[PDB]
Design a protein around this ligand. Structure first.
Ligand SMILES: CC(C)S[C@@H]1O[C@H](CO)[C@H](O)[C@H](O)[C@H]1O
Ligand SMILES: CC(C)S[C@@H]1O[C@H](CO)[C@H](O)[C@H](O)[C@H]1O
Ligand SMILES: [Mg+2]
Ligand SMILES: [Mg+2]
Ligand code: NA
Ligand code: NA
Lengths: 210, 211
């Protein structure tokens, strides 16, 4: 049995004065997650490109919790549909960062990707990255994953560029609001909004204000 | 360069002066055919250097100009640097080649409009408000020529001043121009009349465009 005492007002309320209905309660999902003792505790995916974006390097930093063992390995594989495009495997032990060494509980995988299909609102090309924590012999301990979009965002010479091109933001601010359920969101309503947005030529949304 | 007394009067009566080298090759095709030719650097150099040596002590002169309508040539960059080196007390400006080349400290377009762009190939005349904020641009903008006062004109003059007052980096301009270049001719009875291009048998000519 779980017991949850939810307070409507708290010192946190001083930082939540957004122009919207003030409500309270357990308004988002609640779930139970089972992770092995030796686990992937965090992972970051980055994508760098050459000058014309015809080449890319996917860099994935992975962190683990649990006992460090020489037999532990992490394999990051990148997929485009059912086709594996790249893969990298390595034992834990990051490079030296300071006088006391490096992160023995971390490892960074770097995968080369030639002529990557670029992600944008115009064409949301996506790859799938699978992060496998396993033994050298190939026994899977656990796997996490995420959708990967190859794109570079940067401000150069006063212009906001996406994959080297200046964007024109056709955006709209969107609160999480439902006339019957309040601030509880559901997939159906989210999809409805996105479809309507794109159908009305919007290519960007701001998470006003959280 | 003007008659020497002009600077004396401007020093004493109080007027800011843009002293300009006697260099204009408007009729060439392309306009910079001579100014980008090293064979003409010597001739151009004297028109710039000798002007500076003559008028550098006049307080009324606040800006040096490399000349007018001669496109943008390597000779302009060389002479631009010469002035910056010998007299760092005065900014250097030049409109040729697009009004914002490497040979000018001031964006000094001629007849660039307030809100309307004129996207001419190679040498566009952007709306002055838009010109100031083009990626990487940080220079002040002062029109070397604007509001062409030919005959019944100056329509829209107020639009320029409203913009000048609203935009810090829009710092004015020089109206074109002060006085009609008409000449006196006389009829059979000796009565004078104002004449323009072509009235002296001169041809080809560009008629009333001198007024
Ligand atoms: C009418 C388009 C903006 S829809 C657009 O076309 C793209 C290909 O050009 C991709 O198929 C995108 O997934 C699709 O949403
Ligand atoms: C006639 C245009 C093509 S050029 C235009 O002619 C004007 C005539 O008053 C002035 O001389 C301007 O300075 C010149 O750029
Ligand atoms: Mg507010
Ligand atoms: Mg290549
Ligand atoms: Na101004
Ligand atoms: Na004229």
């Amino acid at each position: 049995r779980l017991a949850v005492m939810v307070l409507r007002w708290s010192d946190g309320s001083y930082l939540e004065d957004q122009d919207m209905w003030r409500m309270s309660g357990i308004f988002r999902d609640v779930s139970l997650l089972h992770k092995p003792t030796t686990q992937i505790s965090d992972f970051h995916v980055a994508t760098r490109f050459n000058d014309d974006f015809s080449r890319a390097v996917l860099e994935a930093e992975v962190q683990m919790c649990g006992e460090l063992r020489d037999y532990l390995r992490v394999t990051v594989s990148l997929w485009q549909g059912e086709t594996q495009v790249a893969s990298g495997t390595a034992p834990f032990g990051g490079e030296i960062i300071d006088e006391r060494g490096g992160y023995a509980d971390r490892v960074t995988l770097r995968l080369n990707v030639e002529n990557p299909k670029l992600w944008s609102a115009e064409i949301p090309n996506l790859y799938r990255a699978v992060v496998e924590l396993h033994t050298a012999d190939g026994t899977l301990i656990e796997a996490e994953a995420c959708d990967v979009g190859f794109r570079e965002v940067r401000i150069e010479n006063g212009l906001l560029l996406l994959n080297g091109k200046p964007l024109l933001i056709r955006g709209v601010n969107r609160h999480e609001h439902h006339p019957l359920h309040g601030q509880v969101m559901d997939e159906q309503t989210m999809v409805q909004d996105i479809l309507l947005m794109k159908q009305n030529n919007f290519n960007a949304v701001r998470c006003s204000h959280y | 360069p003007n008659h020497p007394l002009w600077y004396t009067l401007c020093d004493r009566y109080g007027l800011y002066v843009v002293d300009e080298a006697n260099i204009e090759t408007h009729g060439m095709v392309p306009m910079n055919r001579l100014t980008d030719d090293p064979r003409w650097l010597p001739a151009m150099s004297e028109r710039v250097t000798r002007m500076v040596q003559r008028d550098r002590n006049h307080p009324s002169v606040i800006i040096w100009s490399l000349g007018n309508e001669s496109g943008h040539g390597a000779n302009h960059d060389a002479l631009y640097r010469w002035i910056k080196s010998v007299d760092p007390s005065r900014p250097v400006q030049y409109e040729g080649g697009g009004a914002d080349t490497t040979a000018t400290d001031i964006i000094c377009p001629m007849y660039a409009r307030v809100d309307e762009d004129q996207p001419f190939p190679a040498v566009p005349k952007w709306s002055i408000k838009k010109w100031l904020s083009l990626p990487g641009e940080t220079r002040p903008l002062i029109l070397c020529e604007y509001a062409h006062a030919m005959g019944n004109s100056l329509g829209g003059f107020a639009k320029y001043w409203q913009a000048f007052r609203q935009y810090p980096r829009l710092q004015g301009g020089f109206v074109w121009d002060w006085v009609d270049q008409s000449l006196i001719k006389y009829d059979e009875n000796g009565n004078p009349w104002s004449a323009y291009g072509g009235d002296f048998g001169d041809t080809p000519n560009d008629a009333q465009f001198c007024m």
